[PDB]
Structure formats: C-alpha cells, structure tokens
Design an enzyme around this catalytic site. Structure first.
Site, PDB file in Angstrom:
ATOM      1  N   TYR B  51       0.845  -1.204   0.000  1.00 47.31           N
ATOM      2  CA  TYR B  51       0.000   0.000   0.000  1.00 47.31           C
ATOM      3  C   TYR B  51       0.873   1.244   0.000  1.00 47.31           C
ATOM      4  O   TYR B  51       1.678   1.452   0.912  1.00 47.31           O
ATOM      5  CB  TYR B  51      -0.974   0.032   1.191  1.00 47.31           C
ATOM      6  CG  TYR B  51      -2.413  -0.033   0.738  1.00 47.31           C
ATOM      7  CD1 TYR B  51      -2.977   1.019   0.006  1.00 47.31           C
ATOM      8  CD2 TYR B  51      -3.195  -1.159   0.989  1.00 47.31           C
ATOM      9  CE1 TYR B  51      -4.304   0.958  -0.443  1.00 47.31           C
ATOM     10  CE2 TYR B  51      -4.523  -1.230   0.548  1.00 47.31           C
ATOM     11  CZ  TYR B  51      -5.063  -0.170  -0.174  1.00 47.31           C
ATOM     12  OH  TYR B  51      -6.362  -0.246  -0.618  1.00 47.31           O
ATOM     13  N   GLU B  53      -0.326   4.723  -0.885  1.00 48.74           N
ATOM     14  CA  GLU B  53      -1.085   5.957  -1.084  1.00 48.74           C
ATOM     15  C   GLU B  53      -0.186   7.150  -0.824  1.00 48.74           C
ATOM     16  O   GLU B  53       0.675   7.114   0.061  1.00 48.74           O
ATOM     17  CB  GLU B  53      -2.280   6.032  -0.150  1.00 48.74           C
ATOM     18  CG  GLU B  53      -3.380   5.055  -0.473  1.00 48.74           C
ATOM     19  CD  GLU B  53      -4.347   4.926   0.666  1.00 48.74           C
ATOM     20  OE1 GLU B  53      -3.887   4.829   1.827  1.00 48.74           O
ATOM     21  OE2 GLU B  53      -5.563   4.926   0.404  1.00 48.74           O
ATOM     22  N   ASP B 197      -4.847  14.205 -25.323  1.00 47.35           N
ATOM     23  CA  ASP B 197      -4.859  12.781 -25.011  1.00 47.35           C
ATOM     24  C   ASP B 197      -4.050  12.039 -26.079  1.00 47.35           C
ATOM     25  O   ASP B 197      -4.570  11.695 -27.141  1.00 47.35           O
ATOM     26  CB  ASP B 197      -6.306  12.281 -24.958  1.00 47.35           C
ATOM     27  CG  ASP B 197      -6.419  10.815 -24.553  1.00 47.35           C
ATOM     28  OD1 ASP B 197      -5.394  10.101 -24.508  1.00 47.35           O
ATOM     29  OD2 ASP B 197      -7.559  10.381 -24.292  1.00 47.35           O
ATOM     30  N   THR B 223      -2.231   6.561 -22.261  1.00 47.24           N
ATOM     31  CA  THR B 223      -2.088   5.217 -21.740  1.00 47.24           C
ATOM     32  C   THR B 223      -0.633   4.817 -21.922  1.00 47.24           C
ATOM     33  O   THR B 223       0.105   5.429 -22.707  1.00 47.24           O
ATOM     34  CB  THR B 223      -2.993   4.228 -22.473  1.00 47.24           C
ATOM     35  OG1 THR B 223      -2.776   4.343 -23.882  1.00 47.24           O
ATOM     36  CG2 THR B 223      -4.464   4.517 -22.150  1.00 47.24           C
ATOM     37  N   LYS B 226      -0.251   1.308 -25.573  1.00 45.45           N
ATOM     38  CA  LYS B 226      -0.473   1.304 -27.022  1.00 45.45           C
ATOM     39  C   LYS B 226       0.865   1.374 -27.773  1.00 45.45           C
ATOM     40  O   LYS B 226       1.671   0.450 -27.676  1.00 45.45           O
ATOM     41  CB  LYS B 226      -1.464   2.403 -27.435  1.00 45.45           C
ATOM     42  CG  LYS B 226      -2.874   2.185 -26.870  1.00 45.45           C
ATOM     43  CD  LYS B 226      -3.841   3.293 -27.283  1.00 45.45           C
ATOM     44  CE  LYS B 226      -5.208   3.130 -26.620  1.00 45.45           C
ATOM     45  NZ  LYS B 226      -5.167   3.300 -25.139  1.00 45.45           N
ATOM     46  N   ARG B 232      -0.502  -2.173 -19.062  1.00 47.07           N
ATOM     47  CA  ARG B 232      -1.806  -1.531 -19.144  1.00 47.07           C
ATOM     48  C   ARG B 232      -1.979  -0.537 -17.993  1.00 47.07           C
ATOM     49  O   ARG B 232      -1.948  -0.913 -16.823  1.00 47.07           O
ATOM     50  CB  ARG B 232      -2.902  -2.595 -19.144  1.00 47.07           C
ATOM     51  CG  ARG B 232      -4.262  -2.102 -19.609  1.00 47.07           C
ATOM     52  CD  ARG B 232      -5.145  -3.290 -20.020  1.00 47.07           C
ATOM     53  NE  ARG B 232      -4.650  -3.906 -21.244  1.00 47.07           N
ATOM     54  CZ  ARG B 232      -4.984  -3.516 -22.473  1.00 47.07           C
ATOM     55  NH1 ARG B 232      -5.847  -2.520 -22.653  1.00 47.07           N
ATOM     56  NH2 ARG B 232      -4.462  -4.132 -23.524  1.00 47.07           N
TER      57      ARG B 232
END
Lengths: 405, 405
Positions: B51, B53, B197, B223, B226, B232
């Site tokens: 974790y 955060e 984008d 992303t 691609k 991903r």
C-alpha cells in the site's frame, strides 16, 4: 526473474530491496497481505496485451474467447464465495468499485449517509477532498463515545433527518462486527439503497467468520487485496436487478479496458479462498487478532472498543500520552510497520492522531501464531514504554529480527 | 510459469490458449501491442503487496523507501521521454488519467470541446454513456467531409460559440498528425485550458515521429499500453504550475492505492522507450502503416483521409458495399484481428459502421516489415472481395498461417 535483471538493473535492484523488506519487517498494516506465487504469475502473464472492453460474450472487440473464460471463472468463483446474484470483477481498485456504485444510483449532489471518517469510515465514503464528498452530499453516523460500537440509533436518526438516497456501511478501521440487518432495516425505513463496502473484511466473510452483507445489501463493494489475499483491485457484488446498470457503470461508465491479467489473478485468489485451508487461515487471522488484543491489554494498552471481532485493532495511545504519529515513527525504527490512525472522538488531527491501527492478516499468512502475537505485543510494550531509550529500541530490533529470522 | 499450472489448472489452460492465440493471429487492432518479458516480470512482482497511497517521500504509510525509488524512476524517465515538467504515473488506466484532469480543472456541468466521437474522438471525450458526457457539457469539432483532416476553423468556431473551459485534442481513430500549435492558439483565444490525449501516438511522440504536445498543452494524458508498448495503465504529464493539483486529483481525488507493480512495469517500458532500438521500432511502425495503406489502395480500397501519418489507418468500406461489422466478422474467420470503426460522416450506427480500423504497432513488434505489409493487404483484398467463397477464405487462412508460422 530472468529478463528484468538484465534489462533494467535499477528497477530490479529496487524490487529486490522491497522483497527483502517484506520479509524482514513485522507487517501490521491492517490492509496488507502477501499473495501467492500463483497469483503473481497470473498478473505477470501475457493477458496484459489484450483489449477486452465490454463483458464475456459481449465484448467490443474480437479474439476475447479465452480472456472471457478467465473473467467468467473470476465471476463464478466470486458468486460461489459470497452467494451473490451478480459479480463485476473489472473495477481497477476499491476506489473505482465504490465510484461505479455511486455512478449507478446517485445524481450529482444527492445525499449519502456514511460512517464518520474519524470513527472508521473510508476516504471514499465522503471525504471533502475525495470525489465522493465533492460529487455527493455526505452526512455521517458515529460510534458510541464509550463503547466505540456503531450507534444504530444515530444511523437511524441521521437517515430520517437527512433522507439519504444511499446508506454506506463498512469501514477501514472498525474492529467490531457490523450489523447489516440493522443497516438494511434503517435503509428500508427511509427508502434508501444500502451499499456495504466489505474491503477489509472480505476474506473473513468468505470464511464464515463475519456475517455476509450480500443478503442484506443492494450493492456490496470490496477490494481483492486485503483479507481476501488477492491481487490489487476491486469488485462489485449485487442482486440481478442491478446487474445491467452496474456493468454499464463500470463500462462504458467509469472505466475502459479491464486489466485482464489482474482479473486472472482475481480468479486465482478466489480459487484459493474456496479451499478449506483458506478457512483455517482466516480463523487464525481472527484468533491472532484476539490474542494480540488481549496481549496488548496485558501490557497495559487501551484498545478502541475494548478489543476486536475481526482482523484489526486500534490502540488508543492517550493513556501513554503518545500520538499515533510518535508511535508509528518509533515502531518504524525497530522494524514494526503500523499506521497512525484517528480514534473515535480524537482530540488530534488525522495527520497526528491518538491511535495506531494494527491488523494480523499479513503476519498470519507468514505463519505467525498465538506465541508470536504475545511476543509482538511484548515488543510494542517495550518500545512504547521506552521511546527515549536507544538500548530498549535495540533490544526490540533484535526481538523483531528473531521473529522474522 | 511454475506455480499457477499446479494451483489453478483452469486459469492456466485459459492463459495458455490466449498466449497461443496472440502468436497465431495477425493482430491489427490499432491500440494493441506485445510487452517485453521484463515488463511482465515487473507486473508479476511482490510490489502488489505494498500500500503506497500518496507520493514518493510523502506517503500515507511507512516502508515505502523502495517503491518510492521505483515510482521516481518511472516519473524521471517519463520526463526524459517527453520533456514534461511533471509526471503522474499512478493513473490505473487511460480512463482514470482523463478523469483526473477533468476533476482538476472542471466543475460539474462545465463545457468541454472535444473531437467528434464518430470522427475519431474517444469515449472519454464526451460520450453521453460515459462519465465525461454525463458529468460535463461536451460539444464537438469535426473533420472536413472530403479530406477527413481536422477542420481547425471548426475547432475555432465551436470554441468561440460555446466558450469551453477545456479543449481536448487527440483521438482513438485519427490517421493524421494533429496540429497542437493550432489547438493551443484556439485555446488561448477563448481562455480555455488545452488537454491532449496522446494515448494512441505516445510511442511515436517518444520517438520523434509525431509532434510533441507537451510544449503546447497544459495537460497531456496517455495510456502506457499502445504505441508506447508498456503495461496496461495511464499517465498524466503537465507543467509544474499544475503538478500539485494534478497529484491531488489522482490521490486523494479519484484513486486510492496505486498499483506499484504496474508502476514498476511502467518504469521498465519507459527505460525501453529511451533506447535507440525503440526509435528504430517506432519508425518501422510508421513505415509499415504507410506501406500497408499504399498496398491496401493498390488492392482497390479507399482509406479515410487517403492514407496515414501514424500507426493507424481506417478503411472506408462503402465502395465495396460492406459494413465494418461484416468485414470484422469475415476477417476473424481467417485469423486477422481488426475492429469495426465509424468513419467520418458514417451513414451507419457505431454498432454496424462503414469502416475497419487497422494499426501496425503489434505486427511490427513481432518483426513484420514491408513485404509482410504487402501480403497482409493482399490477404485482406482476397477476403473482402470474396466474402461468399469458402475456398477464398481457406486460402486466406493458409496465407495468414504462413505469416505467423
């Protein structure tokens, strides 16, 4: 690993440090666990290469025959584990699972009733710096100031006064069993949907050690990575009547392509959770938490609610005149990982706090039992009663090392 | 794999089917690629257990020293690749990257100007069934009906009429170079932020084969999976003046714990993209797309915009009196993976379409060159000119097999 060490020495060196760190420290962060090698292999698979927007048999693109099998395995095993009418295994995280349910049943500015964030509620249950509190009008119910158990008459009064469209039950730092039947009764009285966020307790629910919210809730959200001991991600369970809307909320609503490799890993973790040995594991988690609680009390510590029904406990440090921040820092010095955490009616800010949160899921996975709980409690006592003694801290350090090897 | 086959035969069998499928088929879905073994190993690491955060050096919990190194490697390498003042490598997906930027600069119901979804814009650029179109008031600019190039006077007119708070540039199905300078000029005229984008073109931008939006845009989203050929996930780039707000939008705004194993994999992919051989790869992607376009035209096909400047092309199937749906289906029968895709001013629904979208990123990764592009185009011609001939389709099947081995 074979290829990463050669391709990326920097990333590999850091990963190896982290791997060694996870072994050396006593991990007591309540939300953490250690996944199996099978779960990791699934995450490390070629499934990352596949765009699979949509759902099994109803995808945007062709060639999804095999990722469809994987996703269906995840969904069917989730239904086996929790007895839900529908599962959505695509949420990227607990945040996105909650986000999707909110997106399904609420309009911008609708009133939602959740657990007081300083009493155990999560960031996504209405923090004003989180999308939940920004997008919706959150009101809060509290725990009793003496027992630290949810005040169900307060849940009821807040619901009747504020008329929320949705009531959220469940918590990030609540050490007792939640009464889902009572939440549903209150929801029914005011004509609100009930959502239960079982992220912390999902493994215990799967093992029959905490009441199942599924029969009582319209929606159940969860992470897959806490007591469920799965990969990092989210999931939504709901009755069939909401299945179409929930699925549409995840896609095309709030997400795009799912992480098919993570979904494979979810299937693997659900497979593990279905086994008898997971049930034994989960009982040891709860047994260990109760033992650790009792042993901490023996050391003279005060616990929020006076103990625990689940995997986690909260130490109220006020009797020792320590802040959660101070305790967290000094425990870090000796190799014990906890987090500072607000206690109910905390006089301190959430950045300082009067408590530390402790959970047993991770140490139980590593094989710790009752004797180890006694020793962990004794080390915590040694440290927190002697924060100014370097000799005491060095002894603690050595005793921590003895536990982890 | 060693542990998954024994632990979960069902999941393993499906993964193995998928692995074999990825090798056997000619993968022409424009958004897809094949990651390295190093990237996968990073995703399959113990970093899933942590974790984390918050941000490096400023985390919610202790013990983040090593995942901090990993995240900083990802951020610094991203800055090297794109020359951005700030990177956020935590977004779970392209959806969440876009979501975070919207959360940063927009209030509920603000006007946003994006690319017409049937002309190449993405779902997250204002679809009425997506959070973008539900939460914000999206208006659209179009391409010229003859050239299929973005009509910058239309961008300007829409901006001046509607007075958007934000203009979005970039696309899921636009085969030509986008003029970011002109977008910024229009944004400046109307006092709007510019978001680009670059998800589809990010690898080409990194390789100097498409103009970089970073100098022109307030925010750049992408992303990692691609043309960038990474795991991903999502990423945001922005100038230093928005760094604090962007980081807060991701956490505690719209996400919780980041996927540290995926972030490790991001670092690995960025490391690969920084190498000379990635630049050569990316040139082959573009060279292959141009060759495939030319070869398709030689077969008698009409292409949207009359060709391509990037990794992707769109076939306008109207001259053949075929729908995109029909073409997608029959190509699937022979082992060629494409997707139906709306063309600009499509007379058909997005569920039927008059086009197929094709990209060369994946086949280039597998080592396909100009000769293979010629053959792919010839097979597509054979199939689409003989949809009713099983003998023709069987020949195509054999020629596809010959290409993949």
């Amino acid at each position: 690993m074979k290829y990463l060490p050669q391709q990326d020495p920097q990333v590999f060196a850091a990963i190896e440090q982290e791997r060694k760190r996870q072994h050396a420290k006593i991990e007591l962060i309540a939300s953490e666990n250690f996944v199996s090698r099978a779960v990791m292999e699934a995450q490390g698979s070629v499934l990352t290469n596949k765009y699979a927007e949509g759902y099994p048999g109803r995808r945007a693109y062709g060639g999804c025959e095999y990722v469809d099998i994987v996703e269906e395995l995840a969904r069917e095993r989730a239904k086996q584990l929790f007895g839900a009418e529908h599962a959505n295994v695509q949420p990227h995280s607990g945040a996105q699972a909650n986000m999707a349910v909110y997106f399904t049943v609420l309009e911008h500015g609708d009133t939602v009733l959740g657990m007081n964030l300083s009493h155990g509620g999560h960031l996504t249950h209405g923090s004003p710096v989180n999308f939940s509190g920004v997008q919706y009008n959150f009101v809060a119910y509290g725990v009793d100031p003496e027992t630290h158990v949810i005040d169900y008459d307060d849940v009821r009064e807040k619901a009747r006064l504020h008329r929320p469209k949705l009531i959220v039950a469940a918590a990030s730092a609540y050490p007792r069993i939640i009464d889902f039947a009572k939440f549903r009764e209150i929801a029914d009285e005011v004509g609100a949907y009930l959502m239960v966020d079982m992220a912390h307790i999902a493994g215990l629910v799967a093992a029959g050690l905490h009441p199942n919210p599924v029969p009582y809730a319209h929606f159940v959200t969860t992470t897959t990575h806490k007591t469920l001991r799965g990969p990092r991600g989210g999931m939504i369970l709901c009755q069939e009547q909401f299945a179409k809307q929930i699925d549409k909320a995840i896609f095309p609503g709030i997400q795009g392509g799912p992480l098919m490799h993570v979904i494979a890993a979810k299937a693997v973790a659900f497979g593990e959770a279905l086994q008898d040995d997971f049930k034994a594991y989960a009982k040891r988690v709860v047994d260990n938490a109760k033992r650790l609680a009792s042993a901490l009390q023996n050391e003279g510590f005060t616990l929020v609610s006076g103990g625990t029904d689940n995997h986690l406990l909260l130490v109220d440090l006020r009797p020792q005149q320590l802040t959660g921040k101070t305790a967290e820092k000094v425990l870090d010095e000796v190799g014990i990982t906890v987090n500072k955490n607000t206690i109910p009616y905390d006089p301190e800010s959430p950045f300082v706090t009067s408590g530390i949160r402790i959970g047993t899921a991770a140490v139980t996975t590593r094989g710790f039992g009752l004797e180890e709980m006694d020793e962990i409690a004794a080390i915590i006592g040694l440290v927190l009663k002697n924060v100014g003694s370097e000799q005491a801290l060095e002894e603690a350090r050595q005793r921590v090392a003895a536990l982890t090897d």
